[PDB]
Design a protein around this ligand. Sequence first.
Ligand SMILES: [Zn+2]
Ligand SMILES: [Zn+2]
Ligand SMILES: [Zn+2]
Lengths: 273, 171, 16, 217, 60, 108, 49, 318
Amino acid sequence: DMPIVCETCLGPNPFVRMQRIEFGGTCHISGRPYTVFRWRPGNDARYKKTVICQEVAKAKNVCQVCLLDLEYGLPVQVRDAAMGVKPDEEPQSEVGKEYKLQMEADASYAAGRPNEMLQKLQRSQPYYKRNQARVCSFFAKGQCTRGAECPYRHELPTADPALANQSYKDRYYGTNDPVAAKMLKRVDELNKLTPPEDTSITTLYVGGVDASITEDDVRDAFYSFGELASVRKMDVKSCAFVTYTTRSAAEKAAEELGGNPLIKGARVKLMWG
Amino acid sequence: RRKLKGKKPPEGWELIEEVIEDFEQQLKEAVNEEHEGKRKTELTWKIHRLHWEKNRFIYDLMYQRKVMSKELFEWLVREKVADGALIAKWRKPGYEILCSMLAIQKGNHNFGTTSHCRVPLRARAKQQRITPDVQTGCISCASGDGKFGGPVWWNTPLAKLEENRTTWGQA
Amino acid sequence: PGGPGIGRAVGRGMPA
Amino acid sequence: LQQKLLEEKAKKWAQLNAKRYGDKRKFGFVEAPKEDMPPEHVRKIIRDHGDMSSRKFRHDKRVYLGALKFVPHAVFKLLENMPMPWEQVRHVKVIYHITGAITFVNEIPWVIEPVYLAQWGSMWIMMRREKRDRRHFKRMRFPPFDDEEPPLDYADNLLDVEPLEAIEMELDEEEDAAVYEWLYDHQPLKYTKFVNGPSYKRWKLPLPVMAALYRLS
Amino acid sequence: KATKFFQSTELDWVEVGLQVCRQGYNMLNLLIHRKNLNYLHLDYNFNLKPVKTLTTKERK
Amino acid sequence: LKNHFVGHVEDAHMHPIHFEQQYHNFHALGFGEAPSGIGVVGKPVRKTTQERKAEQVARAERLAAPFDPSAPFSLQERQPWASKTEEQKEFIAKAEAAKLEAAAGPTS
Amino acid sequence: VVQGKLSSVNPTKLPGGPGGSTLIKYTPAQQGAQYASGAGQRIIKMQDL
Amino acid sequence: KEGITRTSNLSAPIIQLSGHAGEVFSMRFSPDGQCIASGSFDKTIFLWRTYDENENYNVIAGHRNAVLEVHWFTDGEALLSCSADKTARCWDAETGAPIKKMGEHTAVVNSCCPLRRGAKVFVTGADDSTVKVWDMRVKKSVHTLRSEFPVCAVAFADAGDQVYSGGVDNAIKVWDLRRGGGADVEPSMLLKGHSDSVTGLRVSPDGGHLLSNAMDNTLREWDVRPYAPPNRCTKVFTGHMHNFEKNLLRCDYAADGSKVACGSADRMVYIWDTSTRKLLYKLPGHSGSVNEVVFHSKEPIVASASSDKTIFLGELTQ
RNA sequence: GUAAGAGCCUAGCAUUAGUACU
Ligand SMILES: [Zn+2]
Ligand SMILES: [Zn+2]
Ligand SMILES: [Zn+2]
C-alpha cells in the first residue's frame, strides 16, 4: 500500500508523486512478482523504483530501493557485523526461498539498543546524491550529442573497478558486498591506532578535550581498561597524559577508545603518547 | 491523396497550394529519413514540428492575416490538409502556440498531467527547463514562452528567426 | 426517489 | 492589512477560489477525446520498427507478440472496411499502437442500403459489359506478389501514385439526374440534409432519388 | 483508443492493410523466433518453411 | 503498534489543487508548506503594459503587411531548424585507448 | 471470491485507463529535521500506472 | 457487552454517511431533527434520515458547481443551498423540485444564513466582497452591502435586523440593514482579535454570542449585545487546525449552548465545553479536513462532514 | 538401429539498485 523506503530515497519534497505499478517487476531476491513503486525523489533526481518485494524488504529491515538498512542506512553486512548475528540461513535457491516464504505466510531488528558502531559509521545528512541520474554512457565514450540537455550526468565514472558489479542478492544477504567491505576496512584502519615499535611507551595522549572535562572525569573514563600509572591535565592544549602500568591495558584503551569516543559530550581524539 | 482525388478545391487554393505541397513533401521525406544514431523518442519530432509549421501556415493565413476564406479553410480541414483540432486549439486563450494535441491529452501522461512543456518555463525547475518533451520535442509551448511565434523546440536558441523556423511569406 | 447513499455502522479509526 | 498586504492576500484568496472551482476542475468534467495524429506519425513508427530485427526496438518485441491475440480483430476490421469497386481510395479511421504493433480500422461500413444496391447494381451492369466487350480478360495472378519479396512500402510505392479509374457506370444525365453527382461517392450523401448527419445513421431520401436508385438497382 | 497506448489517424485502406499484413507477419515470426525455432521461417506470403531438413526432435 | 512497517500510512483527502500546488512550491522552488500543517520546509534557492502593448503593436504590424491576392505564397527558409570539459574526457579516452591496447620477470 | 476467480482469471477483460491517484499521509519511522528537509510527514500521490 | 448508556435511537453510536462523490462542504440538521441536508463538492445535496435506516431518500441536483453551504428553512421543508456556481437556490425538500434560484452574485457564493425569526429571508456573502440580503417573495435582492475583500462567512442575527460578515480582511463586521437602504453603507461594529481570515460564523441559541472560526487556528467568542465592554471578545479556543487547504471550516453551538464544535483541517472533530473553554471531545475517523460540524436539534448527537466524501453521525458519551 | 539425456568450448535474454572519511 506504500513502499518500505529509506527516507533518503524519498528526497527533500514532503510531497511525493509516485507511480504504482502493480505486478510491475520481479523481486530481485525472491524472484516474486510484486507491486513496484517509481518516483522522482527530487528535482535533481532520477526515477528510482523499488527493487524487492515488500516482505523481502521488511524481513531484513531494508529499503525497497537502496537495499540498505532502514535505521542506519548502511549495507546489510555492516549492520549484520555490528549486530553480531549469524550468517544468513535463508535459502539462496528460489525453490528454497519460495518454500520458506509460503511457509512463513501460513503461520529482532526493532528491539536493539542503538549500536554506537553503526551510528559512528553513518552519514549525518541524507545521501541525496544517491538519487541522481546515472552517468552519461555517451559522455564517457566521448560520443554524447545531447549536450547539457542530457538527463544523464555529464561526468565520467569515478568508481572502484571491483565495485560497479554489485549483486542484489549479495547486498541484501550480506555476502561479499564490496561497498560494506570497503567500509569495514575503513573502520579496520580507524580501529587500527598504531601501537608503536616502542613497546614500553605506556602512555596515551588525550587531545581535543574541552575544559569542562576534569582530570578525574578522564580518570573515570580510562580506569576501566587497566591500572593507571598517572593522569596529567593541561587545559592550555586542552589535552592529557595517561600512563598505565601494563602495556596491554593501554592497548585496550587505544583499541576501544581510538574510534573517537566522546567523554561527557566532548569530541576527543586519542594518540599514543 | 484525399485532396487529390476527384473534386476541385475552393478559391484561394492556388495561393496556398505550392506551400502546402512543399510541407507535404517535407513530411514525406521526414517519414523516409534514417533513424540510426538518434533516440527512439525523437523519431517523430521533425514530423511534429513540420505538422505544426504546416498548420501554422494555414492558421497564419486564416486567422492572423485572414486572407483565407471560410470555405477554403473548411475544405482544408475536411480534406485533412489542416489539423482542425490543433488550429481550433490555437484559437483558445492560453493554447496559442500549443505544439501538439498530444501535449494536452491527459490520459497521455503518467500522472494525468499535461506535458511539462505546457508549463511556463519560469515556473519549472531547472530539470524541466531544458529537456524537450519525449513525444513532441517541445521544450516550451506555453504562451509567453514562444520564440519566433512558435514553441521552443528541441533546438531553439533561448539566433535569428530565419534560422529557426520556416518563413513562408508571399514573394 | 432513493439516492445513491448508504449508512453503515463503523468505528472511528485512530492513529497512535 | 492597510492594502499593503490585504491587496495580495485578498487576491490570492480570490485566485484560489477561482482555481479550486474551475470548469477544468469541477466534478462532472470529462476530458476531451483524443484527436487524430498526422498519418506520418504511424507511417514512420511502422517504417522504422520495420521487421523488428534491430536492437533499438527490442524491448518492444514483447508487446509486439502480445498484439497477436488481437490480430483476428484487426483482420476483421480491415476486411469489413475494404473499398468497393467504385472507389479508388478509401481513407479509413484507424487506431494504432504507439509502437506500431497493431492497427485497427476504427470504422464501420455504414451504407444507405438503397444507395448501396444502386451502386452494386451498376457494378453488375458494368462488369457484364466488360466481360462481354473485353477481348481477353486476364485474371490476376495469385499470390499477387511472390513469397520472397517484402510487402511494399506504401509511402515509397503508393503514396504518390495517382490511382486509376474505378468501375463506374456512365450515368445518364437528364434521367439519372437525381442520383448522378453522388452515386459513386464512398458515403454518398454524408454531408447533405438526407442523412441524420456525418455519423451516417438514418437516411431520408426523396422520391425521384429512390426512383433512380430502384431503377439502377 | 482511450489507453495512451493507442493513437488515431485516417489512413488509406491499402496502407492500413499493408500495415496489418506486415504486423501479422512480424507477430508470427516473433512467435517462431521466440520459441527458438530458428530453423523455420514464415515468408511474406505466410508459408511456414523449414530452412533445413529437421530432426524428429525439431520436427516435434 | 504502528500501521505500515516503517511508520504510519494514513489515507488523505484533499482537493487536487493542493497536492499539486504544494508539490510544486517545494518541488520547483525548493521551499514549500509542510503537509503536516507545521510551518514551511527547506531553504529558498510576469508581464506588463508597454511590453504587452508592443506585442499588440507587432501583431497589428503583421496585419499592416500588404497582401497581394494575385501572388501565391512561397516557402523561403523551408526547414532551417532541421539542417542544424572536453579535456578530462580527452584524457579519459586516452586512458581507454591505453587500457584497450594493454588489454590486447623470471629469474634464477 | 467467486468474482475474483471469474474476473481476475478471465483474460478477455479489456485493459484500460490509469487507476486514479489516491492520496495517503505517510509518517516515517525516522523523522528528523534533515529528512523531508525539516518536514514531519509526507503526502504521497499514489498513481496507478 | 460494554453497555455504555446508549444516548440516541440511532442503531449505533457512530454512523458514517457515504454516497457522496466529492468533498462535503456543509451540512445541516432539520429543525425537527430527523433529516440531513449534506451539500458536497459534487454540486449535489443528499437528504438523509437521521433514524431507522439513515436512508438517503433523495439526491437533489441543479447546481453546476460545489454546493458550499446548506441551511434548512425555519419550517424544515424548504432548503437554502449556496454554491460556487454563483447561484443560491431555494428547494422544496419533500418534493425534489427547486423553488427559486437567485444568481445575482458575480463570484463564488461562499456563505449564507437564513433568518430564524421573521420572514423567509437569508443573507449570502460571496467572493465579490458584497454581503447581500435576500427576501423570498421578491425576485430582486432586497439589500446589497459592499466590503472591499471577499466575504467568507455570513450569519443573520437572532433578532433579525443586523448581519455579521467575516472574511480575509482580518476583522469581522456587524452591519445594520435597516440603517442601510443605501449602496455604500459603512460598518456598524468591528470585532477585531482574529489574526487572519474568518471562515465560519454561528449565532448563539440566545443570540448574544457570535462564534467565529479563524484560520488563525483560533475559535473566538464575541458578544453582540449592544451594551458590551469596549472589547466584545469573550472567549478563545485553541486546538483545531487550518492548513493550505483553506477550506470553508465552520462553527456550531450545541442546541443548548453547552458545547461548541469546530471543523478542522487535521481531520479531527473538535467539541469544546464552552464554559471551561476546554476540549471535551476530539473525535478521529475522518480522512479529509473536517468542513462543518452540526449538533442535532434535540439530542447531544454530533454529525460531522469532511472533505473525504463522508459524514460521521454519532452520539456523545460522558 | 532408435532417439533420450549429462557435460565441454564457443555460445545475445532479462536488469536500473548500489559507489562515503576529523
Ligand atoms: Zn531507500
Ligand atoms: Zn549525454
Ligand atoms: Zn509543447
